[PDB]
Design a protein around this ligand. Structure first.
Ligand SMILES: Cc1c(NC(=O)c2cccc(N)c2)c(=O)n(-c2ccccc2)n1C
Ligand SMILES: Cc1c(NC(=O)c2cccc(N)c2)c(=O)n(-c2ccccc2)n1C
Lengths: 412, 412
């Protein structure tokens, strides 16, 4: 290709806000989005807190008719997608609608809806399943409903790669544009796994923090007292656009997407190898894709989930890739504040990466009181750090050892 | 790119067989794979038949330890993937494992496992959820478990685009190889939605045939008495390989993958527009990708699900794209025999497309007794038709109006 890809529009729901500016304000203030869960009774569970979207009003986006048919993960993905498209200023016409597609994924999809239809099935039999159960619960219906609501006729699909989803969604959408199969893609991810099955499922694996006494301190990536991830909900969407297309309509450009890498660990179903060899291969692939040397990276938005094995692997991988420069770049985990948004994590963190470029500021890793053995990089502990950022990398790693990296650059 | 992509290995579980040769034998004989469902009691449901995989032994592939942790859709996907890799003859080493990835998707994933964990949750509370619930049920764990079992460290992901899944999986894997991010990909899809939630879910939408009296006649694409699709299970995987890579190891090449197209209808959540305008755009995209004129296509493996709206739309789209040549090509739906394998449909049908090329034979559309108004193409009614096939197209269309087309060519 010679086709450059830029970001023209962003949208988000997160535990820190109902839109990108409100969430980013929270990020730069070191605010926690984590609180006891209000929407179900978790008094019998080992983890009773997480990152909820607070005060979401679906009727800002959808009729009550439409919304009642859709699982919350679809509601969230559509909210982020609609926010991003509005933010971009793009006008969809007959001249361009075939060139505009969508790639919004989810890691687990409509778990709450499935749980509710299961209850109906078991209590009252299969005729009590909703007729809207399938199209309201399956992962590709963020892409599907968005394309229908906006008349988008370009490439229409959905990734599901666990915690990597939102990163792969964005990366593969950028490939579509570079290849010429679209001029614009709305890409990202959404998740709402905070139901009994979800919390129970992650809890049954002993994967979650159980710091119920201080939920805001629970997510502490690279801290020696970390004890598992914090489950969070929400969504992130970006409008990706071919550069000449964006220039021709006078779009506001946030940043350029210059590289995308993937790898597989081929190691274990849930733990990475302790040296993060797969993550290293992934990061190198993304830099090679971008035509960048490691020394050109200024900011890493780490995956950094607050797990024992995961966090130290990612340090090892950054040291392996970056060598001495690993001590010059700034690296932080915004999951310290947002928790782990699962399929949406990579989408929200890409947005935070783009804003780090816009605002020339590395967001903090809050709660990093006692860095663990070998966690001796600049992890932007405690407080946001204004600094020079030309290039920002964002990593996501997922169950199965599936890895993704995005590389963004200031646009000039 | 200049990088050509060829098919070196194929694997399948279907209602017609436990491997590709057994299934293909069934296809060319016009055999139905549809029967009353045996593994649950459907006497209270409106549809009590479907296409099951019969006599599957997971212990040919996995230990009983491993297998008990995985939903049947994962079991099936791994079986097809292992069959394809074995079929290819490729040997994985340290020199190539970073260049070999996987893209196996699913439309709905681990529904049976979810249903079972829901029962445990409701009866006995969240501590009775399996610790293996999440990694045994999520869609990306075919990719994940395969990469771990074979040591594959290339691009590792999963599509979920409803009935389009297996087509998009193959197409996007081919893009990986063309782009240079892999030399080999194992790609396709798997599905096992035959549980109460699944049958109940599709039934609640009145989407399924209810011809319980003659299950083998239920799937009748383009027949005027068609009354909905037939739910089927199974999987299909292909080993896609860069041409020089395949040549250098003396691989047996089945066919070349020359084009991949996508589109969105942007019309309705489950029905296509009656003129199949989206499908037409998709097919044209795939031919444009392949550098082919419509007149070069000899065989279409139609999506052809046996629904009222879907089947006639696809006829309209073929007539729009192909013009007079629409009466020269042969087009058939193998779902007449296999039923609708959902996320796997496009993967099995790609395999049937490749074999149509190998064997120079268009598989039949069985049950096409009374073609509906305007269904006046060569639909290979009743009996397989030996003929010249240089180019074979395979379509898949999905909920949300998501479309995909693959174009294969005899390799010379
Ligand atoms: C903790 C976690 C995952 N894993 C990670 O973050 C993770 C972190 C470091 C290394 C690796 N290889 C993965 C994930 O993929 N999750 C998920 C599951 C189902 C659906 C959506 C996400 N979860 C919960
Ligand atoms: C009947 C059917 C679908 N649709 C189609 O085949 C279909 C056929 C013609 C046109 C269009 N646009 C779609 C599908 O996407 N399904 C699915 C749902 C959930 C998961 C997996 C597949 N089903 C059941």
């Amino acid at each position: 290709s010679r086709r450059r890809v830029v970001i023209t529009g962003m949208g988000m729901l997160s535990p820190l806000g109902l839109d990108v500016p409100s969430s980013w304000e929270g990020i730069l203030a070191g605010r926690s989005g984590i609180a006891p869960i209000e929407h179900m009774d978790l008094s019998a569970y080992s983890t009773r807190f997480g990152g909820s979207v607070k005060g979401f009003n679906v009727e800002e986006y959808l009729s009550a008719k439409e919304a009642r048919k859709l699982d919350l993960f679809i509601q969230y993905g559509l909210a982020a997608s609609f926010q991003a498209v509005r933010d971009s200023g793009l006008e969809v016409t007959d001249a361009n609608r075939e060139r505009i597609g969508v790639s919004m994924g989810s890691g687990i999809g409509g778990l709450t809806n499935i749980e509710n239809n299961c209850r109906s099935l078991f209590e009252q039999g299969p005729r009590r399943i909703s007729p809207f159960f399938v199209p309201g619960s399956i992962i590709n219906m963020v892409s599907g409903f968005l394309s229908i609501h906006l008349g988008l006729q370009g490439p229409n699909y959905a990734l599901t790669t666990a915690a990597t989803t939102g990163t792969h969604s964005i990366g593969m959408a950028a490939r579509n544009i570079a290849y010429g199969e679209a001029d614009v893609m709305v890409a990202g991810g959404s998740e709402m796994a905070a139901c009994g099955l979800g919390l129970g499922g992650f809890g049954a694996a002993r994967a979650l923090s159980t710091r119920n006494d201080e939920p805001t301190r629970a997510s502490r990536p690279w801290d020696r007292d970390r004890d598992g991830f914090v489950l969070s909900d929400g969504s992130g969407a970006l409008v990706l656009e071919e550069l000449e297309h964006a220039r021709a309509r006078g779009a506001r450009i946030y940043a350029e997407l210059v590289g995308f890498g993937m790898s597989g660990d081929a190691f274990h179903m849930t733990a990475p190898p302790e040296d993060g060899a797969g993550a290293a291969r992934c990061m190198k692939n993304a830099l090679r894709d971008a035509g960048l040397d490691p020394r050109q990276v200024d900011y890493i938005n780490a995956h950094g989930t607050s797990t024992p094995a995961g966090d130290i692997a990612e340090i090892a991988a950054v040291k392996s890739v970056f060598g001495e420069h690993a001590h010059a770049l700034s690296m932080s985990s915004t999951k310290s504040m947002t928790g782990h948004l699962l399929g949406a994590a990579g989408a929200v963190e890409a947005i935070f990466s783009v804003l780090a470029l816009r605002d020339q500021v590395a967001p903090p890793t809050i709660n990093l009181d006692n860095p663990d053995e070998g966690c001796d990089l600049d992890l932007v502990a405690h407080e946001a750090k204004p600094r020079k950022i030309d290039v920002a990398l964002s990593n996501s790693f997922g169950f199965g050892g599936t890895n993704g990296t995005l590389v963004f650059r200031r646009f000039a």
